[PDB]
């Protein structure tokens, strides 16, 4: 049947509207709640509806976060409404997000099964947009804490990427502790493994470097089997951290003695044909020292993305490249002057 609810626009005036949807169906389940997919009856558009059980007393981290966000590389919150909870002090929040069935994961797994590697052009396009979204959400102090191929939505025709699933996201406040066992194993930063609770949103950059590395290699770079095996996988490439590095990751972790293993060459981590600049970029993302990782903006401005800033550039299918330089003040806040490097003089309006 055709469901109709009174919802509030995600980005926009707090005044409700009716909203009817149909062809609803569960596509995901878990601890977080339930996710459905449906079609809008007046927009035709397909959307995803995440239904979470919320405690009335408190606000909903995810809802609050999605409301500040209005960026082109971030899944848009169309509407949101509530549902009758069962236990008097509980409600079901219904985030009506945008639906895209394609993910950088599916795509990547596609090429992987076809034994070949993803085209460099796409690796630059995807990673680029990923960083902008990171730069944007970080500018608010928001950390996604769950960056991975599966949470990266794609438009197969436009080549546009959107960050999604802010279920683990959180507005970070220095001095206030954050859970250390957060983020999907394969993408979890070293400091999280070492028990850090005073970490920063730079754990998202470590994760991005992992996604990048994964696109270059054809499979995740650090496929640890547990928390301890994760560090072992990391050590296999970066070797063991120096005391200075350990202090940086976790000021409160102490190990009086441990065997020191050196790092392997990045040039050998990847296949021989891997573009050098992708490796270079990757080495500045997968660092033990959190503060040493490139910031999203610095990364967007990296030499690896130079080709995206070229006027002639086009997609392998003659199509145009999505909006890559429509940076806002918010988005540039961390280092406004970099704006002159990110924005090609051939894009200035």
């Amino acid at each position: 049947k055709v469901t109709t609810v009174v919802a509030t626009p995600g980005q926009g005036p707090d005044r409700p509207q009716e909203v009817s949807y149909t062809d609803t169906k569960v596509i995901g389940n878990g601890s977080f709640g339930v996710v459905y997919q449906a079609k809008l009856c007046d927009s035709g558009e397909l959307v995803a509806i995440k239904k979470v059980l919320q405690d009335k007393r408190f606000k909903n981290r995810e809802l609050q976060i999605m409301r500040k966000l209005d960026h082109c590389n971030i899944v848009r919150l169309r509407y949101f409404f509530y549902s009758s909870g069962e236990k008097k002090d509980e409600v079901y929040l219904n985030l009506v997000l945008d639906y895209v069935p394609e993910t950088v994961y599916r795509v990547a797994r596609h090429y992987s099964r076809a034994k070949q590697t993803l085209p460099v052009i796409y690796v630059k396009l995807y990673m680029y947009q990923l960083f902008r979204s990171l730069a944007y959400i970080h500018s608010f102090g928001i950390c996604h804490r769950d960056i991975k191929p599966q949470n990266l939505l794609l438009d197969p025709d436009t080549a546009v990427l959107k960050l999604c699933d802010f279920g683990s996201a959180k507005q970070l406040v220095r001095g206030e502790p954050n859970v250390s066992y957060i983020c999907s194993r394969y993408y979890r930063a070293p400091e999280l493994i070492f028990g850090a609770t005073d970490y920063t949103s730079s754990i998202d950059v470590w994760s991005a470097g992992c996604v990048l590395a994964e696109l270059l290699l054809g499979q995740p770079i650090f496929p640890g089997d547990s928390g301890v095996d994760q560090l072992v996988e990391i050590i296999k490439v970066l070797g063991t951290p120096t005391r200075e590095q350990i202090r940086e990751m976790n000021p409160n972790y102490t190990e009086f003695k441990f065997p020191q293993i050196k790092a392997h060459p990045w040039t050998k981590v990847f296949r021989p044909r891997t573009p050098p600049e992708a490796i270079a970029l990757c080495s500045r993302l997968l660092e033990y020292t959190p503060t040493a990782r490139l910031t999203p903006l610095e990364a967007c401005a990296h030499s690896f993305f130079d080709e995206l800033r070229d006027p002639n550039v086009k997609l392998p299918n003659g199509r145009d490249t999505p909006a890559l330089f429509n940076f806002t003040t918010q988005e540039l806040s961390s280092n406004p002057p970099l704006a002159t490097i990110l924005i090609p003089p051939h894009a200035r309006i």
Partner: peptide, 25 residues
């Protein structure tokens, strides 16, 4: 149970040392 195992390696201060051991087996 690895969470606990990790929690102990971290509490005890034998995370790096232990990971290296496993690295050699």
């Amino acid at each position: 149970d690895p969470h606990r195992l990790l929690q102990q390696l971290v509490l005890s201060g034998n995370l790096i040392k232990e990971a290296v051991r496993r690295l050699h087996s």
